[PDB]
Structure 1
C-alpha cells in the first residue's frame, strides 16, 4: 500500500527522475494541512458507532424488504454481518483519509467485493445506498466546529467525500 508521498515517489522512480522543486511545494502544502487532516479522521473515529448505527437504522426504515422474513438481513447473524460490513467500509475510508490516496481502500477492501456480493446474493445497490448514507452522516459531522480552531478545511471534506463515492460505485 502507498500513501500520497510514496505514490509520487513511485512515479519518479519508475522513470528514474529526481523530484523537481515544484513537486516539493506540492508535498509541502500537504504537510501544511496536517493538523486539519488529522482533525477529520479524529472526528470520524469518535463517532464511528453512531455513524454505522444511524445509517443502518435509516436504511431499513426506507428499505423494509431487507429485514422482513426472506430478506438478506433477516437473521441475527445476517444482520450482524451487515453492520460489520458497514464498519469495514468506514474503517478503510478513514485509512485512505490519512493516507491521502485510495490505495489501501482499493487494495484490501474493494478488490473482489462486487463478485462476493454477487456470489452471496446480496443486493449491491442497497449496499451502495448505505454507503452514501454513511457518507453525508460523516461529512456533516466533519463540518462541525466544536473543539477545533476556526478556519477552512473544505477541500479536505471534498477529498473525504470522494472516497465514499469510490467505495459506492465499486460495489454495485
Structure 2
C-alpha cells in the first residue's frame, strides 16, 4: 500500500521516512473507514454491477457473442462474466491499499499477452471496464465515486497502451 511505497523509497536511500512521508502515511491511515465502506458496497452489489455492465458491453459489441466471436456460447460468455467479477474485486483491493499496486500485480502486468493468447480483443476489455466503471460508480455517493474512479481509470488506461 501507500505505507510500503514510502518504506521502499526510504530503504532505497538508506534512511528513515521523512516527516513529509510520515504525514502522508498518517493521512492515508485516517481514511480507512471510507475505503472499507466502498469495498463492502462494491462486493455486496457485484452481481448487479456485473449484470448492468455486461448488458451495456454486449449491446455495443454483439459480435463478441456471434459465431466466431470470442464470447460465443454459454461457457465462454460465463467466463467473461467471471473475469468481470475479478476486476471488480481488484478495484476493491486498490481502494483499500490507496494505490494501484494490487491491481497491477494481479490483473495488469502481462494482461495483453494473456488476452491476446486467448483471442479476447484488448479494445473489448477497455470497453468492458469502461462500462463496469459506470455501473459501479452509480451505486456510490458522489464523494465515494470520486475516490473510486481513478482505480477504474488506471485499468482502462493500462489496457489502452503498450
TM over 0.5: yes
1:97 aligns with 2:85: no
Contact 2:94 2:102 survives alignment (8 Å): yes
CA contact (8 A) 2:2 2:99 kept: yes
Distance verdict in 2 for CA 1:69–1:45, change over 3 Å: same
- The answer as to 2:156 corresponding to 1:164 is no
Does structure 2 conserve the Cα–Cα contact (< 8 Å) formed by 1:4 and 1:101? yes
Check the 8 A contact 2:129/2:155 in 1, yes or no.
yes
Report the counterpart of residue 9 of structure 1 in structure 2: 7
What is the CA distance between 1:159 and its match in structure 2? Answer: 4.2
Deviation at 1:127, TM superposition (A): 1.1
Give the corresponding residue for 2:16: 18
TM-score normalised by structure 1 residue count: 0.85
Shift in Å, 1:31: 2.1
User: How big is the alpha-carbon RMSD for the aligned residues of Structure 1 and Structure 2?
Assistant: 1.7
Distance 2:159 2:114 in 1: 9
Structure 1: give runs of 5+ residues left out of the alignment.
145-153
Query: How much does 1:30 deviate?
Result: 1.4
TM-score of the superposed pair, with normalisation by structure 2 = 0.90
* Structure 1 contact 127–171 (Cα < 8 Å) conserved: yes
Q: Judge conservation of contact 2:138–2:145 (CA < 8 Å) in 1.
A: no
Q: Distance in 2 between matches of 1:80 and 1:120?
A: 15
